[PDB]
Every structure is written in structure tokens, then in C-alpha cells.
Amino acid sequence: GKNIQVVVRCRPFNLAERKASAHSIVECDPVRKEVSVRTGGLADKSSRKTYTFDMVFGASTKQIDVYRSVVCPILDEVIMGYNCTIFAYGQTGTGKTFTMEGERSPNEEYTWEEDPLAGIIPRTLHQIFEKLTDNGTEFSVKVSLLEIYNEELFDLLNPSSDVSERLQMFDDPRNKRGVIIKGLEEITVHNKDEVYQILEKGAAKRTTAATLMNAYSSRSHSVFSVTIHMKETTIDGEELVKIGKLNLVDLAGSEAGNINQSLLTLGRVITALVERTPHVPYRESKLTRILQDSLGGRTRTSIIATISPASLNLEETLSTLEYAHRAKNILNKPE
Numbered sequence: 234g235k236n237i238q239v240v241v242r243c244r245p246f247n248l249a250e251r252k253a254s255a256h257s258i259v260e261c262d263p264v265r266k267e268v269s270v271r272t273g274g275l276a277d278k279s280s281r282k283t284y285t286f287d288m289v290f291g292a293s294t295k296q297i298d299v300y301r302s303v304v305c306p307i308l309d310e311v312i313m314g315y316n317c318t319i320f321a322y323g324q325t326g327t328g329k330t331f332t333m334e335g336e337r338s339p340n341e342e343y344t345w346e347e348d349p350l351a352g353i354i355p356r357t358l359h360q361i362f363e364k365l366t367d368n369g370t371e372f373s374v375k376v377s378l379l380e381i382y383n384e385e386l387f388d389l390l391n392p393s394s395d396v397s398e399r400l401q402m403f404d405d406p407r408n409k410r411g412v413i414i415k416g417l418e419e420i421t422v423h424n425k426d427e428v429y430q431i432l433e434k435g436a437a438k439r440t441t442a443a444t445l446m447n448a449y450s451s452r453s454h455s456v457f458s459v460t461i462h463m464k465e466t467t468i469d470g471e472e473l474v475k476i477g478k479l480n481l482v483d484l485a486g487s488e489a490g491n492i493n494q495s496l497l498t499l500g501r502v503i504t505a506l507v508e509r510t511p512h513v514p515y516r517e518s519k520l521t522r523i524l525q526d527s528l529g530g531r532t533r534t535s536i537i538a539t540i541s542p543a544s545l546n547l548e549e550t551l552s553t554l555e556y557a558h559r560a561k562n563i564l565n566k567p568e
């Protein structure tokens with residue numbers, strides 16, 4: 234930090250947790266930026282474990298709130314010509330995809346641009362077009378989507394590809410730090426009225442990979458990349474040619490050895506960047522080598538650690554909070 238930002242988003246109870254008679258064990262204090270977990274296991278009030286983060290979003294935080302607090306500062310950075318990454322990390326069913334992608338409201342009540350349930354990806358794409366159209370920047374938007382599953386790469390935006398084809402990755406000559414994902418489809422989003430059809434297809438090919446290859450999004454990393462080419466011109470001012478890049482990663486469930494290793498490697502990359510340790514283990518997983526260029530800096534990185542509020546998931550919630558705390562060691566302040 235302030236470059237690496239680690240924030241926590243707790244979701245509301247789900248129906249499963251109600252029917253299991255789960256109890257609320259998480260308290261989220263946005264002002265003090267703390268999350269407290271009752272380790273109540275025969276002990277009360279005994280065992281409240283407190284963690285402090287850059288931000289904390291209670292179960293009632295709306296999609297727009299997450300965008301404003303987390304994405305806006307990062308997108309301004311992207312538009313300035315820099316290369317950023319936002320992660321969603323946590324146990325399956327705590328809201329990684331809800332945060333990253335969102336959902337449509339019931340319906341057909343909103344346009345996709347006004348839908349309160351829309352997540353980071355569609356909101357970012359809409360804002361890129363709003364901001365850059367509004368100030369008259371000459372720009373082009375292109376997007377790729379790949380899923381890392383079982384240490385294999387899959388292109389989710391290739392129309393004629395097939396779900397079963399794996400992509401190859403090489404190191405970039407002209408850029409140590411970079412890689413080339415041969416044949417990765419980079420679709421051009423010509424206007425904000427193209428984005429929705431594009432996202433639909435990507436989600437459709439995601440569904441096909443799961444049905445056939447048993448490639449469950451639960452156990453795969455989703456990397457949605459958006460690259461913006463910007464020429465900005467002012468008479469008696471400045472002529473700026475910039476290229477911004479934003480990666481929006483929806484990680485595999487934090488709860489098969491290639492997932493543990495890749496997520497733990499990611500944790501070590503982050504900590505090393507925060508700690509400013511000379512050694513950062515990019516090479517050690519495909520996820521972190523793919524994202525190496527968007528990580529060291531000068532870059533904004535944000536991790537949204539997602540948690541459930543229910544006692545039913547105490548172990549995985551503490552696991553998630555430990556992970557997040559390992560990544561960026563923020564200290565508890567006095568109450």
C-alpha cells in the first residue's frame with residue numbers, strides 16, 4: 234500500500250445457512266476498517282479475532298458502492314496509461330463472481346448500464362466509454378477472457394475455438410515481465426452497445442467448458458482483461474498516447490493441488506510487493522506469470538477478499554481473512 238489495497242466484502246446470509254441454523258459470527262466495522270470473527274466454539278464472548286484492512290464492506294454494501302470505493306481510483310490509473318489488477322478472492326459462494334460480474338435484476342426492469350446488480354466488469358466497460366467519450370479521447374477498447382483450469386489455459390472469447398483447446402504461453406522477447414498467450418482472442422468493443430452481447434458469449438462458452446470438460450468455474454481462475462488505446466489531444470496543450478490495462482480476476486474457490494499452489498504463490502507475490510522484498514515468485518504459477526506485468530508497479534492492485542457471515546463457514550472465513558492479512562500486514566489499532 235497505498236498501491237496494494239486489501240479490502241473485505243461480507244455477503245448476506247444465504248438460504249443454506251438459514252436452514253442449517255447458522256449464526257452470525259462476523260462484524261464489519263467500515264469506519265475502523267475492521268472485521269471481527271467470533272471463534273465462539275464453547276467460548277463467548279471469548280474469541281473474537283479482529284483484522285484490519287484498507288476497507289471493509291458489510292453484507293448490505295451495494296454493487297455501486299464497491300465500484301466507487303475500489304474500482305474508480307484504479308480505473309483513473311488505468312486511463313492514465315497504467316496497468317492494474319483487481320482480484321476477487323474467497324470461498325466458493327461468498328460472492329467472487331457477484332462482485333466481478335454481477336447479475337441482472339428481476340427484470341426486465343433495468344438496462345444493463347443501470348442494473349444495480351451489475352458487477353465490476355460491466356460497470357468498468359460502461360465507464361470507460363462514458364469517460365473517454367465525454368472528454369473526447371480517441372480510444373479503442375479490446376477485451377480478452379481466459380480461464381486457468383488445472384494449469385491449462387482456455388480462451389472463452391474465441392468463437393470458432395472449441396472449449397477443449399488449450400492455449401500456449403511463451404515469454405515475451407521485447408518484455409521480460411511479459412508473456413505471450415498465443416491465439417488469445419482479443420475482441421474489439423466498438424461501442425458500449427457491443428459490451429453486453431460480448432459478455433453473454435463469454436459466459437456461454439464458460440458454461441460449455443464446464444458441461445463438457447467438467448471445468449467448473451468453482452475450481453478455475455477467470456481473467457477478464459481490458460486494454461484501452463488512448464490518444465488525447467489539446468490545442469496549446471499536450472498530446473498523450475497512452476495504453477491502459479485492467480485485469481479483473483475472479484479466482485478459484487479458496488476452499489486441485491494446482492489451485493492451492495497457484496493461490497498461495499499469488500499470496501506470496503502480493504506480500505513480497507507490499508514488503509518490497511527483492512524476490513517475488515512470479516514464475517511459480519501460471520496465474521502470476523500471466524499477471525506479472527500488471528503487478529510490480531507503478532500499478533494499483535486491489536484484492537477483494539469475500540467472506541460469508543455464517544458460523545457454518547468459520548474455518549474458510551478465517552482462512553480467507555488470514556490469507557488477506559498475510560498478503561498485506563495491516564495492524565489492529567487501539568479501540
Ligand SMILES: Nc1ncnc2c1ncn2[C@@H]1O[C@H](COP(=O)(O)OP(=O)(O)O)[C@@H](O)[C@H]1O
Pocket residue numbers: 242243244245247292294323324325326327328329330331332336539
Ligand atoms: N454482496 C452480496 N450481496 C448480495 N448477494 C450476494 C453477495 N455476494 C454473493 N451473493 C449471492 O451469493 C450467491 C453466490 O455468489 P457467487 O457470485 O457464485 O460467489 P462465488 O463467485 O464466490 O461462487 C449468488 O446468488 C449471489 O447473488
Ligand SMILES: CC(=O)N1CCc2c([nH]c3ccc(C)cc23)[C@H]1c1cccc(O)c1
Pocket residue numbers: 333334335336337338345346348349350351352354355378429432433435436457
Ligand atoms: C446474465 C448476467 O447477469 N450478465 C450477462 C453476462 C455477464 C455479466 N457480467 C459479466 C462479467 C464477465 C463475463 C465474462 C460475463 C459477464 C452479467 C451482467 C452484465 C451487465 C450488467 C448486469 O447487471 C449483469
Ligand SMILES: [Cl-]
Pocket residue numbers: 563564565
Ligand atoms: Cl495484528
Ligand SMILES: [Mg+2]
Pocket residue numbers: 326329330331450451
Ligand atoms: Mg463464482
